[PDB]
Every structure is written in structure tokens, then in C-alpha cells.
Design an enzyme around this catalytic site. Structure first.
Site, PDB file in Angstrom:
ATOM      1  N   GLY A   1       2.259   6.366  10.150  1.00 12.18           N
ATOM      2  CA  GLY A   1       3.704   6.256   9.942  1.00 12.18           C
ATOM      3  C   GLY A   1       4.265   4.942  10.440  1.00 12.18           C
ATOM      4  O   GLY A   1       5.407   4.601  10.170  1.00 12.18           O
TER       5      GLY A   1
ATOM      6  N   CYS B   1       3.105   1.857   9.704  1.00 16.33           N
ATOM      7  CA  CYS B   1       3.078   0.743   8.734  1.00 16.33           C
ATOM      8  C   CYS B   1       4.476   0.281   8.405  1.00 16.33           C
ATOM      9  O   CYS B   1       5.395   1.100   8.270  1.00 16.33           O
ATOM     10  CB  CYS B   1       2.311   1.063   7.452  1.00 16.33           C
TER      11      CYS B   1
ATOM     12  N   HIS C   1       0.775  -1.231   0.000  1.00 15.57           N
ATOM     13  CA  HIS C   1       0.000   0.000   0.000  1.00 15.57           C
ATOM     14  C   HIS C   1       0.822   1.305   0.000  1.00 15.57           C
ATOM     15  O   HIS C   1       0.259   2.407  -0.110  1.00 15.57           O
ATOM     16  CB  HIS C   1      -1.116   0.017   1.058  1.00 15.57           C
TER      17      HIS C   1
HETATM   18  C1  LIG Z   1       0.583   3.349   7.966  1.00 12.19           C
HETATM   19  O1  LIG Z   1       1.605   3.980   8.278  1.00 12.19           O
HETATM   20  C2  LIG Z   1      -0.730   3.754   8.625  1.00 12.19           C
HETATM   21  C3  LIG Z   1      -0.778   3.281  10.098  1.00 12.19           C
HETATM   22  C4  LIG Z   1      -1.800   3.874  11.065  1.00 12.19           C
HETATM   23  C5  LIG Z   1      -2.659   4.925  10.723  1.00 12.19           C
HETATM   24  C6  LIG Z   1      -3.562   5.438  11.669  1.00 12.19           C
HETATM   25  C7  LIG Z   1      -3.580   4.902  12.968  1.00 12.19           C
HETATM   26  C8  LIG Z   1      -2.716   3.860  13.324  1.00 12.19           C
HETATM   27  C9  LIG Z   1      -1.836   3.340  12.372  1.00 12.19           C
HETATM   28  N1  LIG Z   1      -1.918   3.129   8.042  1.00 12.19           N
HETATM   29  C10 LIG Z   1      -2.353   3.321   6.786  1.00 12.19           C
HETATM   30  O2  LIG Z   1      -1.804   4.038   5.947  1.00 12.19           O
HETATM   31  C11 LIG Z   1      -3.647   2.628   6.475  1.00 12.19           C
HETATM   32  C12 LIG Z   1      -3.944   2.673   4.987  1.00 12.19           C
HETATM   33  C13 LIG Z   1      -4.964   1.608   4.725  1.00 12.19           C
HETATM   34  C14 LIG Z   1      -6.316   1.967   4.596  1.00 12.19           C
HETATM   35  C15 LIG Z   1      -7.275   0.992   4.346  1.00 12.19           C
HETATM   36  C16 LIG Z   1      -6.860  -0.344   4.239  1.00 12.19           C
HETATM   37  C17 LIG Z   1      -5.513  -0.711   4.384  1.00 12.19           C
HETATM   38  C18 LIG Z   1      -4.563   0.273   4.620  1.00 12.19           C
HETATM   39  N2  LIG Z   1      -4.622   3.491   7.134  1.00 12.19           N
HETATM   40  C19 LIG Z   1      -5.009   3.215   8.392  1.00 12.19           C
HETATM   41  O3  LIG Z   1      -4.600   2.226   8.996  1.00 12.19           O
HETATM   42  C20 LIG Z   1      -5.976   4.200   9.030  1.00 12.19           C
HETATM   43  C21 LIG Z   1      -7.253   3.538   9.505  1.00 12.19           C
HETATM   44  C22 LIG Z   1      -7.998   4.339  10.548  1.00 12.19           C
HETATM   45  C23 LIG Z   1      -7.424   5.452  11.160  1.00 12.19           C
HETATM   46  C24 LIG Z   1      -8.161   6.156  12.112  1.00 12.19           C
HETATM   47  C25 LIG Z   1      -9.450   5.756  12.473  1.00 12.19           C
HETATM   48  C26 LIG Z   1     -10.019   4.645  11.861  1.00 12.19           C
HETATM   49  C27 LIG Z   1      -9.293   3.932  10.903  1.00 12.19           C
END
Ligand SMILES: *[C@H](O)[C@H](Cc1ccccc1)NC(=O)[C@H](Cc1ccccc1)NC(=O)/C=C/c1ccccc1
Ligand SMILES: *[C@H](O)[C@H](Cc1ccccc1)NC(=O)[C@H](Cc1ccccc1)NC(=O)/C=C/c1ccccc1
EC number: 3.4.19.12
Lengths: 306, 306
Positions: free
Chosen positions: A143, A145, A41
């Protein structure tokens, strides 16, 4: 004495962490020998996530679409493939700090240490269990991930988790180091939610053995239970069914404490039914389920405090 | 999101750990540049502990009384001194892996990561707070003496603790890296016990702010309290008196959440008086006091989930 949620020392893993940028997206990667692993991703934009075709997004990229930074140094990408939900980026250098490692898919109930990382720099380490519903109760911000989960045996690092996303309940989902998700989850913006979770029965029992090794017997009772009579109570309190395999795994702890497993089960049945009555077990007011039988043996004394 | 007891990554510290043997006693030491630090009780036999004169025990030792092993390599001792309750052993090699470091004496209430170690090899890492009664609730077995506590800022390791002993209640006592004990404790076999402990009020409040940043407001109320009216309740529940300095430190969290500190205090007063009613706060049924205001800021989002 004492009992703490304990992580593996993180040094062998800290030396593998890098930064991976594709456009305006930054995350973490894992650099072993001449490969960097990272969530696929990383290639996506915001709108991409509603509907990504990863094969189609990746064909539009060259080796040099990817910047990988190891500390201050840039590593040059000279090769890439997709494997399930991961990218595998081949680079100009073998990591001088690659440790002996393996990739393993861990099972629900098992535990691992998470090295939380931002911009390729490790910020913290803690211990997590894989829940029955295939999520972890992590602590992650944007950040994180590409942060990885692991266990260490002797001097080998068994990598088991890479972080990919946070679910709406605030729990965390990701994949093994083959890019295969734990759980029914997918790396796309849909209405997915954690399934209903269960308490890990095997771990609870291990932890009661830990409490006994450490010197506490208050919660024991005169009673015994059959496997089957225990499980009817278990189902009612949203605990996993105990199986004979689980009984056998608890052998060594059983032996060390001289408490038969089904006797421990009877104690547990009584804790579930009556509560703890303002008492604590190893400093906890609730029944803990994130310590495996393995974890108890690693940490606790080989000699019981009778 | 999420909130976990999080340790610093341990790599910079793992590279400093060595083994120290004097006769039949083995423990751990810390090797920075050309010095190895270790508990002075390494020189003692069993009977020595009832009545040791350390000056008298050490004069009977030569440099070569001490074997120091770094991994597989033996390091040769060429110098030694005693500093308070530590030995400082000068060796033939500067540690190539000495990081930027400092020695600090931490204050009650503050937290640190412990790298538990046996025979100079790191086995686990966890986070501890210095209790008001100057002990830590560690997890240590025999062989762990010389294991060290630390914090990391940027790339500097602030060493703050070396482990020396377990008290009868199962809690742990040791010294700073100057060999000066935290607490009224001494490295001799006497009838010493942990003094009565107190709940760390400042940390509890920080942790309620953490719960609010993470999205939970249930425990707030309409009320306010004076510093003084809070403390009368505090004394009754065995909490530390809140001071204006503590109020000021909670400024930034206050600002980020828009909850005035004395309003948070009122919420806390109400939690102490009424309980939590089978509810949880950040997954806990009890009020947590091992997270400082600093720890909450390091871990939690800079943006509140309103
Ligand atoms: C990666 O660095 C990041 C990690 C993260 C983000 C927010 C909170 C904790 C950890 N995550 C992402 O980029 C992913 C992208 C993604 C979206 C859909 C499917 C798979 C991957 N985004 C999220 O994880 C954010 C989800 C979220 C945040 C806040 C409230 C509800 C859901
Ligand atoms: C050092 O490696 C070792 C650490 C240890 C030992 C047992 C349990 C947990 C950690 N500790 C010691 O060698 C010290 C020696 C000592 C004795 C008196 C004063 C100062 C130092 N011994 C202990 O800490 C053992 C105390 C104890 C053990 C079991 C039950 C009650 C007390």
C-alpha cells in the site's frame, strides 16, 4: 546539542498526497497543480507482473478507468500519459496546496525524507540515504507504493523519489519524479536483487566531524595519511574510495573544527583497524554513514565545543 | 518490511507555530484558536535566570510587551496569564489552522515526535522517548525553546511536550502543555543534573518482537524465566523491573509471533549475559529501547514472516 536522524517537516508534502485506484489496486499519488503522479504498475494485475507490456496495458484504459481521491473529494481524470515508469494523470482541479517545487534526481550517498503513506493518507516520516547500490533502507508495507522522498530548501520542495517495490533483501527501490528508476531495477516480477553495497565514506567522515563539533575528540590520533594510503585500507573494509572532490566538500567542517581532512582520514583508518573498544560516537557503537556533510551543517552548531 | 525511527507527519503542527519576542529574547510559541503558548522564561534577562521571581517579572509587563509573529503577520496580544512554567497569551485572531487537539502528559517510556523550530519556523522532525529520568535525547540549539512534542491519533494532535532547556549532559528538559515540568527540573539557572537513567525494558522487548515479525529468530532460546528471576538479572544490567502490567501489554505481539513473553524475557536475559556476538538485530548492534509496543504495532506488518 545532540544528534538525531532528522527529517524535513512534511506539511507541504502531506497536502499533495492523493489516492489512485485502477481496478482492485490502490496506491498513492502526488498531485501538483493539475497533475497526479503515480507508479505505472497501478494498471497491472498479479499475472500481468510476470510479463507486462505497459504501452499495451495503458491503451486499453480511458481517463475514467482511474479514480483519484483527494481526502473525501473525487478528482476527475481528463487526460493521461506514461512517462518512463510513472503515469501522469491530468485532472479537473489545480491543487490549491501545491507548494513551490522542483524535481531532482539525487545521487548515491545523498539523503532525503520519506513520507510513508497508505490510501493517500500520510502515516509517518523518516530520513533515508540513497545507498551506493541504489536502494534505500526504508520501512514500507503493501500500500506504500507512490509514497515520495524529498528535500526542502527555503520553501521549495525538491521531490526526488517515488516508491515502487521491495527487493528480496527487504530494501526498497523506486524512481525519480521523471519515472526513471534509480539503479538497474525494473517494474516487472523478475529475479532482480540489490547489488553488493558499500559504506558511504564521505558521510562517515562528516559524522566524525559532527562528533567533534558536539564535543567529543577521543577517536582522533597523531597521524596523517595520504589519499592513496587511506583508500587501500578503505577497499579492505568495503568503504567507498575517497576522492579529492570529497576532501574539498569536507573543507568547511575541517575549518570549523581545525582538523585537517587527511587527519580525520587517519583517525577513521585507526577506527576501522582497531574498532571502538566498547566506546561510542554520538551515542552509536558503529560508524554511521547516513549523514551527509550538508546534514551535519544543517543540524550541528556553527560553534564548536572545544 | 524494514524498521525505522518514524515520526508523525508534522503538517498539523507546522501550522500552529509562531514566533514570540519579549525584549531581546526570541523563541517559539504554539498558537491554538486564540491562544499562544510559550515558555515563561521568555520574559527573563541573563541575570534574571540566577534568581527569577516570575510573578514579579510578569506584573511589570503589558499585553503589548509581547510581539507575536505568525509567518509575516503580527498578531496582537490582548490578554496574558501564567500557568505554571508557561505563558498563555490571548490574541486578536483564532488560528484558522488549529487542528483537533488535546493536551496530554505522557509517561516515562512513551515516545513522541519533536518538531524542532527556530524563529517560529519548523526546521526538522524526529522521534524521542521520554526517558525514565524525565529527559529526552533531543537535538536542539539556542532558539529552539517553545518547540513542541506530539502524537497524532486519527486527526487529533495530542501535544505532550514543550522544550525549555538543555542540561549539562546535553540532554533536554521541558514541560507538558500545562507548563508542568517533566522531572524535578526548574526554569532557573541552578546546578541541576539529569538523574541516573535506566534502560526501558518494556521497549526493548517490544523491539525483539518487531525483529521476529520482520523475520529474524536468531536470538531466541529454549529457556523460560520467572518474572522474578528476570528482574534480578535486569537490576544488574541497569534495566527497569518488568511488571505484570508490562507482560500483559506485550500480549498482542506475543500472540502475533507465538512467543510467550517470559520466553522473550529468557531470550533477553541471554542477550544481556552473552552479548550479541557481532550480530545485529534489525540492523542494530545494541538493544534498542526507544520503540514502544504501540510503535511496533503501528509500523510492523500485521502478518509475521515465519
Ligand atoms: C505497493 O504498494 C507495494 C509496496 C510493498 C509491498 C510489500 C512490501 C513493502 C512494500 N509493492 C508492489 O505492489 C510491488 C509490485 C511489484 C512487483 C514486482 C516488480 C515491481 C513492482 N510488490 C512488491 O514490492 C512486493 C515485493 C516483495 C514483497 C515481499 C517479499 C519479497 C518481495
Ligand atoms: C531556548 O531557546 C534555549 C534552548 C537551547 C540552548 C542551548 C542549547 C540547546 C537548547 N534555552 C534557554 O534559553 C535556556 C535558558 C534556561 C536556563 C536555565 C534554566 C532554564 C532555562 N538555556 C539553556 O537551555 C542553555 C543550557 C546549556 C547550554 C549549553 C551548555 C550547557 C547548558
Amino acid at each position: 546539542s545532540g544528534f538525531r536522524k532528522m527529517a524535513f517537516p512534511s506539511g507541504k508534502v502531506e497536502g499533495c498526497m492523493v489516492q489512485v485506484t485502477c481496478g482492485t489496486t490502490t496506491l498513492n499519488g502526488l498531485w501538483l497543480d493539475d497533475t497526479v503522479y503515480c507508479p505505472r504498475h497501478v494498471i497491472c494485475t498479479a499475472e500481468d507482473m510476470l510479463n507486462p507490456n505497459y504501452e499495451d496495458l495503458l491503451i486499453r484504459k480511458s481517463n475514467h478507468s482511474f479514480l483519484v481521491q483527494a481526502g473525501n473529494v473525487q478528482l476527475r481524470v481528463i487526460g493521461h500519459s506514461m512517462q518512463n515508469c510513472l503515469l501522469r494523470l491530468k485532472v479537473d482541479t489545480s491543487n490549491p496546496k501545491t507548494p513551490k517545487y522542483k524535481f531532482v534526481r539525487i545521487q548515491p550517498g545523498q539523503t532525503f525524507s520519506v513520507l510513508a503513506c497508505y490510501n493517500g493518507s500520510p502515516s509517518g516520516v523518516y530520513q533515508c540515504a540513497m545507498r551506493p547500490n541504489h536502494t534505500i533502507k526504508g520501512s514500507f508495507l503493501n500500500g506504500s507504493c507512490g509514497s515520495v522522498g524529498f528535500n526542502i530548501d527555503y520553501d521549495c520542495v525538491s521531490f526526488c523519489y517515488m516508491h515502487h517495490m521491495e527487493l528480496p533483501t527487504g530494501v526498497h527501490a523506486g524512481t525519480d519524479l521523471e519515472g526513471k528508476f534509480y539503479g538497474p531495477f525494473v517494474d516487472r516480477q523478475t529475479a532482480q536483487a540489490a547489488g553488493t553495497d558499500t559504506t558511504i565514506t564521505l558521510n562517515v567522515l562528516a559524522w566524525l566531524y559532527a562528533a567533534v563539533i558536539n564535543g567529543d575528540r577521543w577517536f582522533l590520533n597523531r597521524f596523517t595519511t595520504t589519499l592513496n594510503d587511506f583508500n587501500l585500507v578503505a577497499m579492505k573494509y568495503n568503504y567507498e574510495p575517497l576522492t579529492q572532490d570529497h576532501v574539498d566538500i569536507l573543507g568547511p567542517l575541517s575549518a570549523q573544527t581545525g582538523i585537517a581532512v587527511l587527519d580525520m582520514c587517519a583517525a577513521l583508518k585507526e577506527l576501522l583497524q582497531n574498532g571502538m573498544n566498547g566506546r561510542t560516537i554520538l551515542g552509536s557503537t558503529i560508524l554511521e554513514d547516513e549523514f551527509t556533510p550538508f546534514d551535519v551543517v544543517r543540524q550541528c552548531s556553527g560553534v564548536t565545543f572545544q
